[PDB]
Write a protein that holds these residues in place. Structure first.
Motif, PDB file in Angstrom:
ATOM      1  N   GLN A 127     -22.106 -23.731 150.198  1.00 33.84           N
ATOM      2  CA  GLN A 127     -23.447 -23.272 150.524  1.00 33.84           C
ATOM      3  C   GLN A 127     -24.447 -23.809 149.505  1.00 33.84           C
ATOM      4  OE1 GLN A 127     -25.509 -20.816 148.843  1.00 33.84           O
ATOM      5  NE2 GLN A 127     -24.117 -20.902 147.086  1.00 33.84           N
TER       6      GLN A 127
ATOM      7  N   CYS B 211     -28.152 -24.280 147.311  1.00 28.33           N
ATOM      8  CA  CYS B 211     -29.126 -23.583 146.482  1.00 28.33           C
ATOM      9  C   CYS B 211     -29.896 -24.624 145.679  1.00 28.33           C
ATOM     10  CB  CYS B 211     -28.449 -22.549 145.578  1.00 28.33           C
ATOM     11  SG  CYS B 211     -29.580 -21.648 144.494  1.00 28.33           S
TER      12      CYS B 211
ATOM     13  N   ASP C 101     -31.341 -23.783 141.925  1.00 31.16           N
ATOM     14  CA  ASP C 101     -31.139 -23.658 140.485  1.00 31.16           C
ATOM     15  C   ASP C 101     -29.662 -23.445 140.174  1.00 31.16           C
ATOM     16  OD1 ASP C 101     -31.081 -22.537 137.706  1.00 31.16           O
ATOM     17  OD2 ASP C 101     -33.257 -22.664 137.940  1.00 31.16           O
TER      18      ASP C 101
ATOM     19  N   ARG D 129     -28.373 -22.048 137.569  1.00 30.40           N
ATOM     20  CA  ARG D 129     -28.184 -20.721 136.990  1.00 30.40           C
ATOM     21  C   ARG D 129     -28.089 -19.652 138.071  1.00 30.40           C
ATOM     22  NH1 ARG D 129     -32.579 -20.811 135.705  1.00 30.40           N
ATOM     23  NH2 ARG D 129     -33.199 -22.954 135.191  1.00 30.40           N
ATOM     24  N   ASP D 130     -28.902 -19.772 139.121  1.00 26.35           N
ATOM     25  CA  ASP D 130     -28.839 -18.812 140.219  1.00 26.35           C
ATOM     26  C   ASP D 130     -27.479 -18.861 140.905  1.00 26.35           C
ATOM     27  OD1 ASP D 130     -31.299 -17.747 139.774  1.00 26.35           O
ATOM     28  OD2 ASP D 130     -32.294 -18.689 141.489  1.00 26.35           O
ATOM     29  N   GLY D 131     -26.972 -20.068 141.158  1.00 27.57           N
ATOM     30  CA  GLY D 131     -25.655 -20.193 141.759  1.00 27.57           C
ATOM     31  C   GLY D 131     -24.554 -19.645 140.871  1.00 27.57           C
TER      32      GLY D 131
ATOM     33  N   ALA E 122     -24.854 -17.230 138.516  1.00 25.25           N
ATOM     34  CA  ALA E 122     -24.967 -15.776 138.495  1.00 25.25           C
ATOM     35  C   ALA E 122     -24.714 -15.140 139.855  1.00 25.25           C
ATOM     36  CB  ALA E 122     -26.348 -15.366 137.984  1.00 25.25           C
ATOM     37  N   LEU E 123     -24.702 -15.927 140.931  1.00 26.86           N
ATOM     38  CA  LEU E 123     -24.513 -15.412 142.281  1.00 26.86           C
ATOM     39  C   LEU E 123     -23.163 -15.800 142.873  1.00 26.86           C
ATOM     40  CD1 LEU E 123     -26.730 -13.733 143.785  1.00 26.86           C
ATOM     41  CD2 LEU E 123     -27.042 -15.724 145.260  1.00 26.86           C
ATOM     42  N   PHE E 124     -22.777 -17.072 142.755  1.00 28.66           N
ATOM     43  CA  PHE E 124     -21.535 -17.554 143.341  1.00 28.66           C
ATOM     44  C   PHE E 124     -20.575 -18.171 142.333  1.00 28.66           C
ATOM     45  CE2 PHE E 124     -24.523 -17.566 146.900  1.00 28.66           C
ATOM     46  CZ  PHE E 124     -23.785 -16.917 147.868  1.00 28.66           C
TER      47      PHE E 124
END
Lengths: 51, 51
Positions: A18, A20, A22, A24-26, A28-30
């Motif tokens: 999937q 994205c 950033d 860092r967002d990936g 902290a999320l995935f």
């Protein structure tokens, strides 16, 4: 007195295939894409460095 | 006509600081000493060998 063309930002990929933007967002999320069961370290220096 | 002195079979160590004789049962009951988490490996050969 000239128009400046704008280009849309590209995108990166993360776990489960999937998309994205950033990293860092990936993270902290995935999290990461591939998984390693663990890491074994090894240190050199002074005992102050160890503590 | 001569004495036959006998010596007992010694023992080995296993997990949690116990003792036993047969390595097979000691492994099957208590486990190794130092833990490894991954055996990430690699092979070389033909299709039949990999299958």
């Amino acid at each position: 007195m000239k128009e400046l063309i704008y280009i849309e930002e590209p995108s990166i990929l993360f776990a489960h295939g999937q998309k994205c933007t950033d990293p860092r967002d990936g993270l902290a999320l995935f999290g990461p894409l591939n998984q390693i069961y663990g890491i074994k370290s090894g240190v050199v220096g002074t005992q102050k460095g160890l503590q």
